[PDB]
Amino acid sequence: GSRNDRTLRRMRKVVNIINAMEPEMEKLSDEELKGKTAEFRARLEKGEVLENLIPEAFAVVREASKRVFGMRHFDVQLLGGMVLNERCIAEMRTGEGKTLTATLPAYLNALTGKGVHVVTVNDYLAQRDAENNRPLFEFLGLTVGINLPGMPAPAKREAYAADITYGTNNEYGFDYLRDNMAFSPEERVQRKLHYALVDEVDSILIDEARTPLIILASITFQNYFRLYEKLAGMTGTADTEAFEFSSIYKLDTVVVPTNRPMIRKDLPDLVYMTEAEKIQAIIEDIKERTAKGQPVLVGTISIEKSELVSNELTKAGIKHNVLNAKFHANEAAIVAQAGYPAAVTIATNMAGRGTDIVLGGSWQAEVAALENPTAEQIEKIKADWQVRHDAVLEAGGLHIIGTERHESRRIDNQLRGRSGRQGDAGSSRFYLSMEDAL
Amino acid sequence: GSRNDRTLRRMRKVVNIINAMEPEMEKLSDEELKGKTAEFRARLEKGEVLENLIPEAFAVVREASKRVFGMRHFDVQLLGGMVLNERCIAEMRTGEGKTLTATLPAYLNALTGKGVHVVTVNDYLAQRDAENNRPLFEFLGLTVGINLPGMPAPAKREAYAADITYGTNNEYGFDYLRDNMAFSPEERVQRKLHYALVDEVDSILIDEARTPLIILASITFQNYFRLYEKLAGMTGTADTEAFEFSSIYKLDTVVVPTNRPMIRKDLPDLVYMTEAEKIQAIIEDIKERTAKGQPVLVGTISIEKSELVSNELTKAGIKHNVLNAKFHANEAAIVAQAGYPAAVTIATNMAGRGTDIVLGGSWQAEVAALENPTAEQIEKIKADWQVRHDAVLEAGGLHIIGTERHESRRIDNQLRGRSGRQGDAGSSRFYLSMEDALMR
Ligand SMILES: Nc1ncnc2c1ncn2[C@@H]1O[C@H](COP(=O)(O)OP(=O)(O)O)[C@@H](O)[C@H]1O
Ligand SMILES: Nc1ncnc2c1ncn2[C@@H]1O[C@H](COP(=O)(O)OP(=O)(O)O)[C@@H](O)[C@H]1O
Numbered sequence A: 001g002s003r004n005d006r007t008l009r010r011m012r013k014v015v016n017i018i019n020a021m022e023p024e025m026e027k028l029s030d031e032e033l034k035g036k037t038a039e040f041r042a043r044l045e046k047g048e049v050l051e052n053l054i055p056e057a058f059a060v061v062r063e064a065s066k067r068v069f070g071m072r073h074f075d076v077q078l079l080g081g082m083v084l085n086e087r088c089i090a091e092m093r094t095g096e097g098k099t100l101t102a103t104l105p106a107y108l109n110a111l112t113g114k115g116v117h118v119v120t121v122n123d124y125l126a127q128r129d130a131e132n133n134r135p136l137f138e139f140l141g142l143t144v145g146i147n148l149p150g151m152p153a154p155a156k157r158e159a160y161a162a163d164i165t166y167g168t169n170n171e172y173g174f175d176y177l178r179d180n181m182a183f184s185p186e187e188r189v190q191r192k193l194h195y196a197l198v199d200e201v202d203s204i205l206i207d208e209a210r211t212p213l214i215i216l217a218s219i220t221f222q223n224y225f226r227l228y229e230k231l232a233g234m235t236g237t238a239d240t241e242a243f244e245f246s247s248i249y250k251l252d253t254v255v256v257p258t259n260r261p262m263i264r265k266d267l268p269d270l271v272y273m274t275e276a277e278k279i280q281a282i283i284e285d286i287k288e289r290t291a292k293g294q295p296v297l298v299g300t301i302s303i304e305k306s307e308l309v310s311n312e313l314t315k316a317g318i319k320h321n322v323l324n325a326k327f328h329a330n331e332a333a334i335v336a337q338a339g340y341p342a343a344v345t346i347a348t349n350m351a352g353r354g355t356d357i358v359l360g361g362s363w364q365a366e367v368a369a370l371e372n373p374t375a376e377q378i379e380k381i382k383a384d385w386q387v388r389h390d391a392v393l394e395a396g397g398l399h400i401i402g403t404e405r406h407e408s409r410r411i412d413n414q415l416r417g418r419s420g421r422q423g424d425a426g427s428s429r430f431y432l433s434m435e436d437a438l
Numbered sequence B: 001g002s003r004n005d006r007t008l009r010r011m012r013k014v015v016n017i018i019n020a021m022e023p024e025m026e027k028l029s030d031e032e033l034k035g036k037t038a039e040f041r042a043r044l045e046k047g048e049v050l051e052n053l054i055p056e057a058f059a060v061v062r063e064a065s066k067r068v069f070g071m072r073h074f075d076v077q078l079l080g081g082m083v084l085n086e087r088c089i090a091e092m093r094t095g096e097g098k099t100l101t102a103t104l105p106a107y108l109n110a111l112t113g114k115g116v117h118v119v120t121v122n123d124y125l126a127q128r129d130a131e132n133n134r135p136l137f138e139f140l141g142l143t144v145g146i147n148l149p150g151m152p153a154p155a156k157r158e159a160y161a162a163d164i165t166y167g168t169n170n171e172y173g174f175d176y177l178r179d180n181m182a183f184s185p186e187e188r189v190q191r192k193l194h195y196a197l198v199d200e201v202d203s204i205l206i207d208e209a210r211t212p213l214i215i216l217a218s219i220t221f222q223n224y225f226r227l228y229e230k231l232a233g234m235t236g237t238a239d240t241e242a243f244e245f246s247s248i249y250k251l252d253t254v255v256v257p258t259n260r261p262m263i264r265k266d267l268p269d270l271v272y273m274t275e276a277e278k279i280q281a282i283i284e285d286i287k288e289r290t291a292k293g294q295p296v297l298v299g300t301i302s303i304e305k306s307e308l309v310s311n312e313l314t315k316a317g318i319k320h321n322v323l324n325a326k327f328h329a330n331e332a333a334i335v336a337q338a339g340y341p342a343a344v345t346i347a348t349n350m351a352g353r354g355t356d357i358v359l360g361g362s363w364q365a366e367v368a369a370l371e372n373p374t375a376e377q378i379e380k381i382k383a384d385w386q387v388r389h390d391a392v393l394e395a396g397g398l399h400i401i402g403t404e405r406h407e408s409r410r411i412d413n414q415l416r417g418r419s420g421r422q423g424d425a426g427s428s429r430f431y432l433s434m435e436d437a438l439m440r
């Protein structure tokens, strides 16, 4: 309430400062910029306050980013970074740029030398992120490691050896369980847990409250993140159980504002008597908007209903797509194009979570699909796509339709978010069923 | 070889010493005996050498035992105790008294205050053992805890709080996994791992090293016992995989000699062509010896063959019994009576492992089955049983028949051991198939 305000206003000013250092940093040469880290390390080494070089450090990361990726951190992203450095939960909507916002607090912390642990929901994302978030990090003179399941102890010492590490909550935890069952300390792959930046905190710290089972026993990984000196998370959904975050991990939730006004239209739930009445009113809806030239993603609670709705959808003569959270790699390729004017995708709970759905398709997947990277063909794609885009927009952007509400609204909010991002005009609808009286 | 000898001879002398202190300790009053622990604690507290009060400490445990249970530790048992205090694997045959031999090294170690972890193959045994091994321990002024699966954290702090604790390898391990996923140290149920005495070491440290699957992750409790300051084990089969014990846990195997000469007769494997030829030659064999008045246990590799042989055995008109390692508690009650002159039992891999099969039945289960514990009726059982006993013996004691050899001889040796214990005359037979005898 007035608390979220005073706290946002609080650092909102520190944000203004960062923007003031922009004309300066804009001048420092590449070598002078890169070497900005040495200075920060010395400064800190001299015992200077951690949270003291935040405005200056964040100003650097923005600059490097703008130079390496050509992406200037939105001040709202800076706002988010700051929250991520305080044992807070920065809530930022889907499409807001959490992936890049983390380079900020991950850079500030990756200076002391203790390492930084960015957590993700799955292996594909963890590596994917590290992969294309690395150039910014290698520029600023840091090393990025990727921790995965089948990595021999040697490799894992490497991935945890870097200044910045990426992995999934499980593997990190599993490594910790395995390090305790270690022969000799020199056989351990981790180090003293320092800072953990959790991407999709709710998913990781709340839904993953469902114990794993050893077979016969069962344990949880709840407390694993409480062993970290610094624990911080980010998500596009947190205010729901915003109380549980502090009752366990003592994490204060800060709802960051969006960059561009959120104009997506969340339509009222239409209730039907039978499952058939539902699935039929939706295939009738997609089939409709389809012609209109508007893309539409469908969400299902489980593969179960996902399969069923898939056939009922192909039966009405409709070429759709299905993602069951099995092949993240490939699903991701597909979800990244569900923004094409004529596109229908059926995703499950954690189907293509993590891939930004650009209105009108993603031309980058188009250019990366041409052995001949010439500034000529790209133009007839970066401008060709541009057409499909504004077209899809005029057509009300992306429309998602929940086949059913989850036990937790938070969950069936993650679905909505896949739409109307970075200011995009889109819409969402939920189709409930009376027959769901179970 | 000459190594096992020099090492056995080595402590064999320390054994002689223990026997010399017997006439002395025999005089100390109950209170003076019990208070023998205080002295040991003080002595050690004064910084005296651990392995220095072994001959004296073991002499005490024998005395207390002789008094509380009325069981004087065989010197060979004392031999075993010693081995169990050195990061060794004391190999002692089935029926040799491992359960009581552990009170020795478990007492020596349960003095420093760090606790002692006796490991068993299953929950039933772990509690069963603590239960009726306690009186000796409470006498000598020590507390005994029992760690089990559904015990709330509170309870578990208790069981690990005692001087001596009993549980299964898994639960101990599981506790350790759960202690690492603890909120705050004050939420942990274990203490720093000190001494672990593994009963049935091969089973626990070799067969069990099969990796539990987290659900996805794969880890092994192989290293769990390597975190213990002191690791020691005991079994009636270790000499086989004696090399793997040191290549992982660095444990030297010591083959302790038996109390009474081992006269059981292990007969040659009879190979048959078909499974029917097998199961038929065995039901023909048990049906035979049955009449003779000799009991016979059958071992199967899995419940699979166990069920099959059970029907084929009842089909020939034979009242038998079956244990599938499901209800340890009950099976145990039954295995303890498979020594009755006319008894047929079909057990699986880990069916009634742990229960000593007395020739002629177990009268103790008979006396404990009478609300009226009078010195009168017991006599007509302790002397009545005595008849069945010598009778079963003359009939060649217990005869076990393996329905099929296991991948590891060690395993199908555990079967044999269920017979001919403490000197008993018995016999064992293995019935293989042709599509096996082709060992090539
Ligand atoms: N500061 C920025 N400037 C320009 N584009 C950005 C910026 N930050 C993020 N993006 C783009 O917007 C999308 C939103 O990023 P994403 O990683 O999917 O974050 P989130 O998890 O919040 O949805 C990305 O695909 C990225 O290409
Ligand atoms: N010192 C002893 N004096 C008398 N009986 C003993 C002694 N030690 C062991 N026994 C008996 O011999 C049997 C062997 O015990 P058990 O627990 O089955 O050990 P093991 O693991 O060697 O088979 C027990 O039933 C017990 O009654």
Ligand SMILES: [Mg+2]
Pocket (backbone or CB within 6 Å): A098, A099, A199, A354
């Ligand atoms: Mg993301």
Ligand SMILES: [Mg+2]
Pocket (backbone or CB within 6 Å): B098, B099, B199, B354
């Ligand atoms: Mg035993």
